[PDB]
Amino acid sequence: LPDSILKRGAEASKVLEEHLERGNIIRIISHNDADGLSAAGVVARAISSMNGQFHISILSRLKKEFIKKLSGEKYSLFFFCDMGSAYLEEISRLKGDVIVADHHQPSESEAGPHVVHINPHLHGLDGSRDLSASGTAYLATRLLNRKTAPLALVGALGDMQYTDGFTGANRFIMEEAVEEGVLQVHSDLKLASRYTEPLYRSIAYTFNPALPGLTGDMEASMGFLENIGVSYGVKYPDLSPEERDVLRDELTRINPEIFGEVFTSREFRNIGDLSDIAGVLDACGKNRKYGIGIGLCLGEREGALDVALELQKNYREELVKGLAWIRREGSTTLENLQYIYSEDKAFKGIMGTIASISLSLKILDPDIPLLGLSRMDQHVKVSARTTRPAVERGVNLGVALRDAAASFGGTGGGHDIAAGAMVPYRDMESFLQLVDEILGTQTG
Template sequence: MASEKISEYSRVRLISHNDADGITAAAVMCHALLREDIVFHASIVSRLDENVVETVNNSTDNGDLVLFCDMGSGQPELIEKVKNDTIIIDHHAPVGETTAYVMVNPHLADIDGAYYMCASTTAYVVATEMNPENKELAGLAIAGAIGDKQLFDRENGLILKEGIESGSVSIRKGLKIGDGELAEVLERTPEPYLDITGEKEKIANFLNILGISGPIEELDENQMKKLTSAVALKLTKKASPEAIDASIGEVCILNHEAIPNVYDMVTLLNCCGKLERGGLALTACLRDKKAAEEGWKLAEQYQKVLMGQIKKAEKKVQKRQHLRYIQGEDMEATGMIAGVVIRYIHPDLPFIALNKVDDVVKISGRGTRKLVDSGLDLAVALREAASGVGGNGGGHNIASGAAIPPGSEEEFLEALDTIIAKQMGNNADEN
């Protein structure tokens, strides 16, 4: 239904989220719209709020379709204010009744959008229904799923298989990191986060002991096995079990894209998104090599900033009974920081990052699959705790976000700790 409805329009106003999944979802739809000669105006935003709705209403004509990607399912009160026909392509758990003409969401088909379909793979399904030639966009869809730390079982797995069969994606086994000189990649790459990450001398000693050097993409099978075994040994000491799966295995090579290594592509998209250069990232996904080169330079610089932020955050972690958290002002990429902490440093409790930016405190919450299996639902927990202090929140059970007023942090954390305790079957008074 969504594909048919989109094809009825000559102009589309597209809004999508500024992370790797949101940007690739937008890119998949932009490619599909271009193929159908449909004019579009795309914007990449950090979140859906009143300002975005106002911008959309002021920049659309009566006959335009408004298409939201990677957002909208949890904000029916905002979607209702959009004056034009609206379609939502999203994977966050729907909340309430929507006024959107169509909502395409895996949850509506009993598919868990936190694990088995993201916004980009959902957009890929819509795009291939619009035109079978859009199957060549599988690489972009896979990049979004990897950016959202999803599993490649079920629906995502089928799309990966389709991408391999069509030649859009190739597979290389090894360490799941970007390409380049191994020592330099390990120094700047925050995932996997090891006891040597960001430490030039320690990395040199590590590689010297292994007897490995050179570009990672040129390592032979034995060298790669030696490297992955050594990394796995480091991870088993502290990281969550899923961190090993996320760090070692199959590396996707995107054969049609301007950035072939999927981890380099995800890095570019996330970094450009955080630097408010979502348009540049989207252009790179539209296979513009100059945009990709510019985006990669920004990403390399930003990774150094991010590494410093993670090192600082590691020292500032505080603990309550049922969660760990950090508080700060104008921190960079709190979602990435929270993800690194929960996977590689403190996987036993949910992790919350509170970041005061201007007149709002932005919240990033992360869990693990093990915690979710124990009852954790961060989407519900953050939404309830935030609404209790005059804020809002939502997302996935394993990864979610919120925004609250400055000064309400303590009340928010108290409420959140209690909610998480109930979710996971704990008594809040227990040690």
């Protein structure tokens, strides 16, 4: 790991330690997916472990106008996670100290004298694969509290930064979490919610690593297990030793990445492994139930574990229904991308997730960039997802959605493999065409 990035994290640590000293309340601004919430939890946790105080604002998206409304307000430290690198200039205007812990492409702008900017892109590192907002927040606070390291990896998995291994900075965090004693790693089937779902349901809800034929299909997962002689209504731990062996070898046929590293932390037993945690935060994020999600990151797991578990159930059921909708009505294919459109409010905040999973399952052609579109009154919210070989051939979704969205005065961005945008509904056809041309240019 580059020395410079630990050094920059130390500098954020120091600025954070100072504003706590003077008693005053830290302002935490973050995103609403697993990375954003876990990133916000890394920080809240650090600040709690020194009896400090914080106000959280969670956002779907950061705009120039929120930053101006941040511009009034009298707080002396603003801590941005998973956002803000792209608005460095506007953020620089704030009169008060700022920390930005992000893993998106920075705008080209002079970072303020009161701004400490921690971002893998600034240190030769890769923000798409090797470090997320949660890891960056960890690096910012590691020298105050090492116990948040598992949270950091939850955010990495939220952002799909596990491909048969943590890599880069995330590997570094994993190792440091293991020597702290707060993370354990062992080999096993990487099923969803192994301690709280019966096996057929655990299989149905294993979206990553994906299980073609089984994932999203309760009937098929049930019949599958009967076919191979493995009990379907028992939880995975409760199976016989011989049923475990049969199931490894049979699921490994379907996808070999299903057997691998499982990440546990004693603080999260009774909820599940690290990917399960990330699952829970996404369900919390999608239902606008921040506080329960953030609360889970601090330890507030009383009757509220049970509330999160049941948000998760309904989210996973909307994801199942989501996927069947894609199998039913497939995509609409242009030259260089394909898209999927909805006004069903039920697919409100999951369009991005169901696109990613449809591609891993290869229900939609994984080599053709996919844009999911949710109507929002007079606007349309775009969630673009592709795969690594498409990125290797030149696709960059963050670049293409920013530039296409900006032709309509709109906002877009993200990373190479996944991005967002907001455009007027009236401009959908024209936006999609423009995105189609740019992706053509990027691959030609």
